[PDB]
Design a protein around this ligand. Structure first.
Ligand SMILES: [Cl-]
Ligand code: NA
Ligand code: NA
Ligand code: NA
Ligand code: NA
Lengths: 30, 30, 30, 30, 30, 30
């Protein structure tokens, strides 16, 4: 169903934001 | 249910964005 | 209900994006 | 209704991301 | 309807994230 | 239907965030 697909896509979004957070941490640390 | 799953994923997203804000703060500082 | 919880989480997301915008503004200024 | 509230919060979110893009452009110019 | 309004606001958010990716590219370039 | 349109726009958002992560990675490297 589409609500589950939406939940799954939000999970993917959370994962990409976690990647952004880590890269921004690396910029900050530098 | 999937509506709760969606709300929980949005909660995770809010938490990652708080992390990003914290790292960007550190970028501004350095 | 869960729709209200989703609207709430979106509000928290908007709040964090405002913090990000203010930090990116600080990076730009410096 | 909460669906309208959700649409409104997504509108606020789009507005914040436009503000972020503006500052990131200024960072790029610097 | 509000579901279409939500889909249209998500399309606006994607467009803004595109702009952010483009400016981050410009930052990485310089 | 609009729930599929929403899921599709969330997919486009995840794709743009993957692009931001990659550009921020490039900034971190630089
Ligand atoms: Cl930077
Ligand atoms: Na992280
Ligand atoms: Na200014
Ligand atoms: Na560019
Ligand atoms: Na990396």
């Amino acid at each position: 169903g589409e609500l589950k697909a939406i939940a799954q896509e939000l999970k993917a979004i959370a994962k990409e934001l976690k990647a952004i957070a880590w890269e921004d941490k690396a910029i900050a640390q530098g």
